[PDB]
Amino acid sequence: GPVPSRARVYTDVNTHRPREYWDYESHVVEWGNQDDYQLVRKLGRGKYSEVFEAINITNNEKVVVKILKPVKKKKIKREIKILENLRGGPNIITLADIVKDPVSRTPALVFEHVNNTDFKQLYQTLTDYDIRFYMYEILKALDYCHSMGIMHRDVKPHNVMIDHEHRKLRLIDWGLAEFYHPGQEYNVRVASRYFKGPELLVDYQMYDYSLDMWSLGCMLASMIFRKEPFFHGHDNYDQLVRIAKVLGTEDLYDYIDKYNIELDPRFNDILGRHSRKRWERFVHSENQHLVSPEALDFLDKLLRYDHQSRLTAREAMEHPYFYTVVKDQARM
Ligand SMILES: Brc1cc2nn[nH]c2cc1Br
Ligand SMILES: Brc1cc2nn[nH]c2cc1Br
């Protein structure tokens, strides 16, 4: 059987809180009236999504309304409880209200207004400095939610709303976020293909906060190398092969042996043997301005097979890559 794992940081934070904090199934929701709002327009968030710009009639304030997709209410209360727990945290989207349509009875979340400019639309046109600035901003949100015992699990450019004129950033879509409890085995069918950590791909269930750090690595790699996605798999099996071709197969199989992972039979033929590639392989004339020794050292320390080996959010924030950002923050 597989070898147990525990989080390097924030391991027992939920244990030391009242049951009410994390026992989201016992949470009682006071449902508001969706009649306090009027939808203005549908926000283009993809096919699955049902997000709208709206106006709160009571005070003429712009808001964003997310109509919850028919789901186990377990998941609904989970997203609500996580949002409520993280409310007011650095770069976390603010849940304003919780409502139901009186006729349909369908649940909906009302958020603080933000522009519909997600990071995917801006993150391939950024300067060196701005990549570091916004990465550091994302890291604030990750450290906070992890410090509060929550892993996001869907960290990707599409879930990062950015107001580039006022330099503001919000981490959004907490619908896959879950509370970390040491020993718990989690669902591995979370996150999007290109940002799925190796632990998800080999079906290692006892993962932690460090999942989000892999996803952050994938985003960083994609930005500095101008390669979208960085790991471009056909499916979940070929995704790990794409990773394997960069990180190499030696650390992969070492990782499998360390945690005694029963590797799916399909993987046997498709992985092969590959060297660990030096990051220089991905630098070219059109991306050389975004790539530095500091960026490559930072990237390397996020993208590890072994989830234990990856930088924590706080450790990442104190990496040399962010020195000029930290400096400028204190100046202001
Ligand atoms: Br306002 C509002 C109007 C709606 N029509 N159908 N669903 C709705 C949800 C909200 Br909130
Ligand atoms: Br825009 C937006 C989209 C979201 N998806 N899930 N939560 C969200 C919050 C906002 Br604000």
Residue numbers in the entry: 3 to 334
Please give me the paper's original passages concerning this structure:
In order to provide the structural interpretation of the thermodynamic data, we have now grown crystals of human CK2α in complex with either 5,6-DBBt or TBBt in the pH range of 5.5–9.5. 5,6-DBBt adopted a single pose highly similar for all pH values. The hydrophobic faces of 5,6-DBBt stack on one side against V53 and V66 of the N-terminal lobe and on the other side against M163 and I174 from the C-terminal lobe. The phenyl ring of F113, tilted relative to the benzotriazole ring, may limit the penetration depth of the ligand into the pocket. In the plane of the benzotriazole ring, the ligand position is predominantly determined by the salt bridge between the N2 of 5,6-DBBT and the ε-amino group of K68. The bromine atoms of 5,6-DBBt are pointed roughly towards the mainchain oxygen atoms of E114 and N117 and the sidechain carbonyl oxygen atom of N118. 5,6-DBBt is bound in a single, pH-independent pose, compatible with salt bridge formation of the (anionic) ligand, but not halogen bonding. The most direct evidence for a pH-independent binding pose of 5,6-DBBt away from the hinge comes from the crystallographic data that shows essentially superimposable ligand binding modes backed up by anomalous scattering data. Summarizing, thermodynamic studies demonstrate that at a pH range of 6.0 to 8.5, 5,6-DBBt is mostly or at least partly anionic in complex with hCK2α due to binding-induced pKa perturbations from 6.9 in solution down to 6.1 in the complex. Therefore, halogen bonding is outcompeted by salt bridge formation, even at pH below pKa.
CK2 is a member of the CMGC group of eukaryotic protein kinases and a cancer drug target. It can be efficiently inhibited by halogenated benzotriazoles and benzimidazoles. The holoenzyme exists in vivo as a heterotetramer consisting of two catalytic α- and/or αʹ-subunits and two regulatory β-subunits. CK2 phosphorylates a diverse range of substrate proteins with serine/threonine residues in acidic regions.
